[PDB]
Design a binder for this molecule. Structure first.
Ligand SMILES: Nc1nc2c(ncn2[C@@H]2O[C@H](COP(=O)(O)OP(=O)(O)OP(=O)(O)O)[C@@H](O)[C@H]2O)c(=O)[nH]1
Ligand SMILES: [Mg+2]
Ligand code: NA
Length: 422
């Protein structure tokens, strides 16, 4: 017993992403998400289901909480996807009134539900829990504010356990005009209390789906969020299936976080289709992961990699994984202080993702984060310098001084990344 993880889904986006994540986890473990049972004994594989799944005498359940300040996103999701016996009511923490896209309302209002959330965690979490994953968007009010509150709360209440965030940044044109405030307040909070923040944005996700999967249309967020679920599943695969070289959450964080502030990570995965997994080399897949076309954050270029984690899944030639390392270091730009022999952390798992031959997942700590964050800062300043949209932050406990304090700390993080870039 040990290595267990609890996943908290917060707000509309965080819970919708949760559907794709848990669908992927059940499929990888050959669990029927509708019956809660193994699909069969014969195809039960040697694995460690307890990382994300609770086995009870009646069947399997997600080690998850489904948290929102309004009920519709979760209720509609559970009905449409027929999740009623897996996303069960005892795992939901729902209110009625919404955060109205204001971080401060999400933070304040969420405080009222913290006792129930802690009781549920303390009621069912094994003592050996290794950590928490918080799934949320940063541009709305509940994912951002309540997610921030939860990051702070768990790090304070459970010292010694990992707190990792999977966080969706605003799109290149924001689809919430308040998103700069909500994103700066969230990234400030996560810089204080998270151990590692894995970032995504919808501009990059849409580009990948349209250009790598060539979907003719995206009608529901499930046809975008599957990419976030894929990253979450694959970087934990070596906790759940056999393989030559396994790694846990804080093992990956320790290899990535060069300075305490540099905890903001860009993920990528290759290939995106089964057909490509059958006609690709380890070299080709790693090169795709390091290419901006595959980054799940919208970036202007390759940037400079400070540190990276690569998970090789499936039918992997270990000699190829090792021999390409000099080629990665020669062909990918790394930050000036990175020694030629350093900057790579490998995990190798024998389990391929559903029906693929092999797959590589990259977590990159990259100086280009400074460009992504600077753009957020420029959006923030365009509102804040005019005093636009501040009233309902002020009315919910975030003074104008507090907004500025969060902005200035955010800027200090940007400058650390820019300094490392050289
Ligand atoms: N990738 C992805 N983005 C989403 C999803 N749902 C919403 N978004 C994005 O998330 C941001 C809006 O945040 P929501 O998650 O809707 O807000 P919330 O956390 O429910 O907060 P409130 O509605 O303000 O209480 C926008 O940038 C949306 O485009 C989703 O399922 N997947
Ligand atoms: Mg909402
Ligand atoms: Na909303």
């Amino acid at each position: 017993p040990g290595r267990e993880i609890l996943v908290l889904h917060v707000g509309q986006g965080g819970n919708q992403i949760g559907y794709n994540f848990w669908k992927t986890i059940c499929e990888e473990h050959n669990i029927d998400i509708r019956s809660n049972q193994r699909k069969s004994v014969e195809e039960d594989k040697v694995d460690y289901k307890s990382v994300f799944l609770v086995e009870a005498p009646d069947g399997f359940h997600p080690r998850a909480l489904f948290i929102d300040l309004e009920p519709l996103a979760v209720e509609f999701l559970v009905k449409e996807m027929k999740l009623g016996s897996f996303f069960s009511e005892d795992l939901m923490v729902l209110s009625y009134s919404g955060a109205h896209n204001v971080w401060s309302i999400g933070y304040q209002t969420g405080k009222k539900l913290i006792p129930v959330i802690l009781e549920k965690i303390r009621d069912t979490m094994p003592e050996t829990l290794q950590g928490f994953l918080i799934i949320h968007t940063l541009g709305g009010g509940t994912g951002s504010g309540f997610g921030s509150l939860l990051t702070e709360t768990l790090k304070k209440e459970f010292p010694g356990k990992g707190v990792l965030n999977f966080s969706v940044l605003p799109s290149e044109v924001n689809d919430v005009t308040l998103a700069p405030y909500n994103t700066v307040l969230s990234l400030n909070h996560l810089s204080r209390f998270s151990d590692l923040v894995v970032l995504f944005d919808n501009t990059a996700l849409i580009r990948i789906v349209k250009d790598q999967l060539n979907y003719p249309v995206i009608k529901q967020f499930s046809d975008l969020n599957f990419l976030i679920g894929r990253v979450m599943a694959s970087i934990t695969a070596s906790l759940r299936f056999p393989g030559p070289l396994n790694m846990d959450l804080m093992e990956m964080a320790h290899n990535l976080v060069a300075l305490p502030e540099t905890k903001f990570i860009i993920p990528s995965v290759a290939p995106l289709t089964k057909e490509e997994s059958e006609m690709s080399t380890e070299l080709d897949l790693v090169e795709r992961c390091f290419d901006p076309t595959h980054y799940m954050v919208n970036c202007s270029g390759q940037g400079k990699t400070i540190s990276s984690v690569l998970m090789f899944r499936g039918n992997i030639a270990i000699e190829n994984a090792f021999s390409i390392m000099t080629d990665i270091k020669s062909n990918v730009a790394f930050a000036p202080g990175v020694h030629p022999d350093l900057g790579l952390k490998y995990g190798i798992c024998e389990s391929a993702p559903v029906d693929f031959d092999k797959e590589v997942t990259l977590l990159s700590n990259n100086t280009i984060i400074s460009e992504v964050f600077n753009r957020v800062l420029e959006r923030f300043d365009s509102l804040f310098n005019r005093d636009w949209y501040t009233s309902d932050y002020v009315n919910a406990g975030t003074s104008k001084s507090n907004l500025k304090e969060a902005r200035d700390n955010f800027d200090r993080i940007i400058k650390i990344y820019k300094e490392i870039e050289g």
